[PDB]
Write an enzyme that holds these catalytic residues in place. Structure first.
Site, PDB file in Angstrom:
ATOM      1  N   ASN A  35     -35.210 -27.804  27.854  1.00  0.00           N
ATOM      2  CA  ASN A  35     -35.739 -26.603  27.221  1.00  0.00           C
ATOM      3  C   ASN A  35     -37.147 -26.265  27.697  1.00  0.00           C
ATOM      4  OD1 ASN A  35     -35.951 -24.475  25.031  1.00  0.00           O
ATOM      5  ND2 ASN A  35     -37.603 -25.853  24.398  1.00  0.00           N
ATOM      6  N   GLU A  80     -28.062 -31.906  20.216  1.00  0.00           N
ATOM      7  CA  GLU A  80     -28.772 -31.866  18.957  1.00  0.00           C
ATOM      8  C   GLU A  80     -29.177 -30.431  18.677  1.00  0.00           C
ATOM      9  OE1 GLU A  80     -31.706 -34.771  17.362  1.00  0.00           O
ATOM     10  OE2 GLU A  80     -33.151 -33.147  17.656  1.00  0.00           O
ATOM     11  N   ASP A 137     -41.857 -22.854  28.172  1.00  0.00           N
ATOM     12  CA  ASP A 137     -40.424 -22.634  27.978  1.00  0.00           C
ATOM     13  C   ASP A 137     -39.685 -22.232  29.255  1.00  0.00           C
ATOM     14  OD1 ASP A 137     -38.403 -22.562  25.732  1.00  0.00           O
ATOM     15  OD2 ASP A 137     -38.047 -20.584  26.602  1.00  0.00           O
ATOM     16  N   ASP A 161     -32.797 -17.632  32.854  1.00  0.00           N
ATOM     17  CA  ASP A 161     -32.335 -16.401  33.492  1.00  0.00           C
ATOM     18  C   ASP A 161     -32.625 -16.493  34.993  1.00  0.00           C
ATOM     19  OD1 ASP A 161     -31.433 -14.893  31.259  1.00  0.00           O
ATOM     20  OD2 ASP A 161     -33.516 -14.410  30.734  1.00  0.00           O
ATOM     21  N   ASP A 204     -40.501 -18.561  30.578  1.00  0.00           N
ATOM     22  CA  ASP A 204     -40.499 -17.318  29.810  1.00  0.00           C
ATOM     23  C   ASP A 204     -41.769 -17.171  28.995  1.00  0.00           C
ATOM     24  OD1 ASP A 204     -38.088 -15.989  30.456  1.00  0.00           O
ATOM     25  OD2 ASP A 204     -36.961 -17.377  29.176  1.00  0.00           O
ATOM     26  N   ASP A 263     -31.115 -32.501  24.191  1.00  0.00           N
ATOM     27  CA  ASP A 263     -32.237 -32.099  23.343  1.00  0.00           C
ATOM     28  C   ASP A 263     -32.438 -30.594  23.111  1.00  0.00           C
ATOM     29  OD1 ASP A 263     -34.831 -32.968  21.971  1.00  0.00           O
ATOM     30  OD2 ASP A 263     -35.665 -31.709  23.558  1.00  0.00           O
TER      31      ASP A 263
HETATM   32 CA   LIG Z   1     -36.068 -22.212  25.282  1.00  0.00          CA
HETATM   33 CA   LIG Z   2     -35.566 -15.547  30.238  1.00  0.00          CA
HETATM   34 NA    NA Z   3     -36.426 -19.261  27.986  1.00  0.00          NA
END
Ligand SMILES: [Ca+2]
Ligand SMILES: [Ca+2]
Ligand code: NA
Ligand SMILES: [Ca+2]
Length: 481
Positions: free
Chosen positions: A102, A262, A201, A205, A159, A232
């Site tokens: 993530n 999770e 983050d 995309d 992002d 995760d």
């Molecule tokens: Ca994210």
């Molecule tokens: Ca994005």
């Molecule tokens: Na993102």
């Protein structure tokens, strides 16, 4: 059948770099106790040496390169890790590696990036115009160079972030501007769009990102010889990405890799949606059950034990549920603290280990304890329940969740497992007894309590019924031993 997973770590473990060695030497013991799979903590370099691993810095540095002021991770070096995996393999134990895709923390340097601030309670709403911030989005991995991978990370691979190094404002979330820049979808909708969590983050995309994470997934799997994954923060990750990442790795390695994600939300509806969107190609932790267990242990006997399984993943979707009592998110002193009280813990493990549905997990914190927070090792109380699962929890299941305090269930056993069969009875309140059917072929057998909480015996009558007893705030598991 009746496999059992163990999360081999807790948040406040000591930063002595000796954890892989601990796992190495504990392998044969875990196997004897009934553990069939071990979920290891993040194996890569974090933002610092004492990082638990979720502040994922370099997924290709498994304690092999001098980065972040250290070569080893909090748990040890790459060779110690690989020696631990071998020990587990030699003892027939499956290995599930943690997976953090993530975000990335501990960037090597900052970059000037155009962005707008968004509403922390509704990330879909921009609250400022465009302006330049200094974001920690650059990763060059100086101590690793191009070993294992030449991929370098920059702001356009993300992002957003939650920190502008040039202004240092608090409680802010920044969404980057640029071609095709927007929070990913689909993701959980709490806060409007929960794509952003912490650190930088990752932008799912971006094709180069998707391509890179998939390649790393294969490298990670083949390098350590992993049998499965514990994924995760999936509620913060584009659902289709996770679905297809798992598919890719399975197909590229030719291994039907087990995977449990999770999705931390006490909301069955949200979890079921995640399962549909990922096309049911993997399991999820039963967070709702964890909360039921937690709330029951906090109600002083007033919880309606008849509802213990209401609104849980194991109740609605047993084949995709990984049942746990506690983990590193719910243990003491955590943002999501919701630790199942000690008195109730044995009942909780009986509820996950002796029932036929779900893939149960044993928490290292509960098993060996958490000395930094006064939590004693409860393995002496868990081992008996583990032996019950290993040797007796087989065959047809008869439910008796018919009382607000005293509930129980029986397993009739099968010939595939010699002498199998059990009768679990528990009470979150005053003790008592309950007649339960264990099978007519059990007529005349003299059963005893494997937990040892009750010292007498229970003789199955001619019709296959036994009058089982249990002490207050306790659990007994009668078997024909
Ligand atoms: Ca994210
Ligand atoms: Ca994005
Ligand atoms: Na993102
Ligand atoms: Ca009760």
């Amino acid at each position: 059948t009746n496999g059992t997973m163990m999360q081999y770590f807790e948040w406040y473990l000591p930063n002595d770099g000796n954890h892989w060695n601990r796992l190495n030497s504990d392998a044969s013991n875990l196997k004897s106790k009934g553990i069939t799979a071990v979920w290891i903590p993040p194996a890569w370099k974090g933002a610092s040496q004492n990082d638990v691993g979720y502040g994922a810095y370099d997924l290709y540095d498994l304690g092999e390169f001098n980065q972040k002021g250290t070569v080893r991770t909090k748990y040890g070096t790459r060779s110690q890790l690989q020696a631990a995996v071998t020990s587990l393999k030699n003892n027939g134990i499956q290995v599930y590696g943690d997976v953090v895709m993530n975000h990335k923390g501990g960037a090597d340097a900052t970059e000037m990036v155009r962005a707008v601030e968004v509403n922390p309670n509704n990330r879909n709403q921009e609250v400022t115009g465009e302006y330049t911030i200094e974001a920690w989005t650059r990763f060059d991995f100086p101590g690793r160079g191009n070993t294992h991978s030449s991929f370098k990370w920059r702001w356009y691979h993300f992002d957003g972030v939650d920190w502008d190094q040039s202004r240092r404002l608090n409680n802010r979330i920044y969404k980057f501007r640029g071609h095709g820049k927007a929070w990913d979808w689909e993701v959980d909708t709490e806060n409007g769009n929960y794509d952003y969590l912490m650190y930088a983050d990752i932008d799912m995309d971006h094709p180069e990102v998707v391509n890179e994470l998939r390649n790393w997934g294969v490298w990670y799997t083949n390098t350590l010889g992993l049998d499965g994954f514990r994924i995760d923060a999936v509620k913060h990750i584009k659902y289709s990405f996770t679905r297809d990442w798992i598919n890719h790795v399975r197909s590229a390695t030719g291994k039907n890799m087990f995977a449990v994600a999770e999705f931390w939300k006490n909301d069955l509806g949200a979890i079921e949606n995640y399962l549909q969107k990922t096309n049911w190609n993997h399991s999820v932790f039963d967070v709702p059950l964890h909360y039921n267990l937690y709330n029951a242990s906090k109600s002083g006997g007033n919880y309606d034990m008849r509802n213990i399984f209401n609104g849980t993943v194991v109740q609605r979707h047993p084949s995709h549920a990984v049942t746990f009592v506690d983990n590193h998110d719910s243990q003491p002193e955590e943002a999501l603290e919701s630790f199942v009280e000690e008195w109730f813990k044995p009942l909780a493990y009986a509820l996950t280990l002796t029932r036929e549905q779900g893939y149960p997990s044993v928490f290292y914190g509960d098993y060996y304890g958490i000395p930094t927070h006064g939590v004693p090792a409860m393995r002496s109380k868990i081992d008996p329940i583990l032996e019950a699962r290993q040797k007796y929890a087989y065959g047809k299941q008869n439910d008796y969740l018919d009382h607000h305090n005293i509930i129980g269930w029986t397993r009739e056993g099968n010939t595939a497992h010699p002498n199998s069969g059990l009768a679990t009875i528990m009470s979150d309140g005053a003790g008592g007894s309950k007649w339960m059917f264990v099978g007519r072929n059990k007529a005349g057998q003299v059963w005893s309590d494997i937990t040892g909480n009750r010292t007498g015996t229970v003789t199955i009558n001619a019709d296959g019924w036994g009058n089982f007893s249990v002490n207050g705030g306790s659990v007994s598991i009668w078997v024909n031993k």
